Amino acid sequence: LDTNKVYEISNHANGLYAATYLSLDDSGVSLMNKNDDDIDDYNLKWFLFPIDDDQYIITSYAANNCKVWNVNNDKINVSTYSSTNSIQKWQIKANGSSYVIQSDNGKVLTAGTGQALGLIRLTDESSNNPNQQWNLTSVQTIQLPQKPIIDTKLKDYPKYSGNIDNGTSPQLMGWTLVPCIMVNDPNIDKNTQIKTTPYYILKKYQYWQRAVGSNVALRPHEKKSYTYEWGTEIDQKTTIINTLGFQINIDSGMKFDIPEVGGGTDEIKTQLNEELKIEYSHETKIMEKYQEQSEIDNPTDQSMNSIGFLTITSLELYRYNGSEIRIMQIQTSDNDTYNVTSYPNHQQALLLLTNHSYEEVEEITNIPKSTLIKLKKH
């Protein structure tokens, strides 16, 4: 189904609409006649958000604090979204001209009859029960932010000219839309949130940046030990975990948490993996700030300078109101991407030697032939 619409949901058999009481935040869901004398005290508007595996979350649209349909003992009420609560997940299955609405528990939405006319419950699906068929009527469509051009290849890390850049420019490597119900945005109310920014934009940028501590000066014929920093200096608790319900582990892979406030994004993890190209973590340790011991060897008779780069990943989340408003960012660096480069560039010299002569390389790199030979020696 389209998930950028506000829908009314009505029963095929009895023509009544699914509704909550506006003034009770934890309201049960009932069936009301759209011309009832008190219809203005109910909400009939529902917003569908898509989650993994062709399922949906059904959200009270700017009513009941944007709580979502929630099944308890075969009855439906609206409760705070929880990305770890299976009883809030739905399947909506086309069945001729209507739809069957099925809970994660396998039962289906059913209108009561007779003394129970007006009631809605979950029960077992029957062969053909008009009371288990539902119509979705679109009453509003919200135009969504358009996905921009995404890069697929990270530019090379900088090389010495002997000057060198401190990094490269951020490239957008992934972009995806996140249901507002899965976003804890403490600076806006939930009802205003769903009306103005029902989908947030989550971007992933990558680029290279100099590793702090990695600029090393070497004299002739010496090895020098050093340490560079990597990881993140950002507090994950107050940024990504409390906002989206996930953390970045030492692996640079993502790990899903139950946030202090908010429902989280556990139910869209496949979408995140695929659209942001972020691996699931294989570690248990959250990324912090680290120092990797390393060594530079200069086996030549000339001095040398070295510096290292890391691939930075920046995850940034934006409200979208006709423009993007950033509400969260975190940058991390991945020690498995560490690369060093030198001046004079011994690595470029050895590579050049695979299809150039010594005299040619000597000319290109300014490195003497005897050194070129020493270099090749190890």
Curated annotation (Swiss-Prot):
GO terms for biological process: sporulation resulting in formation of a cellular spore. Keywords: Sporulation, Toxin, Virulence. Induction: Probably part of the cry34Ab1-cry35Ab1 operon. Pfam families: Toxin_10 (PF05431). Residues 25-137 form the Ricin B-type lectin domain. Proteolytic processing occurs near the C-terminus yielding a stable protein of approximately 40 kDa; this may be the active form of the protein. SUPFAM superfamilies: Ricin B-like lectins (SSF50370). One of its GO terms (molecular function) is toxin activity. Expression of the 2 toxin genes in transgenic corn confers resistance to WCR and has been commercialized. Gene3D superfamilies: 2.80.10.50, Homeodomain-like. Monomer in solution. Copurifies from parasporal inclusion bodies with Cry34Ab1. Component of a binary insecticidal toxin active on western corn rootworm (WCR, Diabrotica virgifera subsp. virgifera Le Conte) and probably also on northern corn rootworm (D.barberi). Both proteins are required for maximal toxicity. The larval midgut epithelium is probably the primary target. This protein alone has no activity against southern corn rootworm (Diabrotica undecimpunctata howardi Barber), but it synergizes the toxic effect of its Cry34Ab1 partner. The 2 proteins individually and together form ion channels; channels made in the presence of the 2 proteins have higher conductance. Belongs to the toxin_10 family. This is Insecticidal crystal protein Cry35Ab1. It comes from Bacillus thuringiensis.
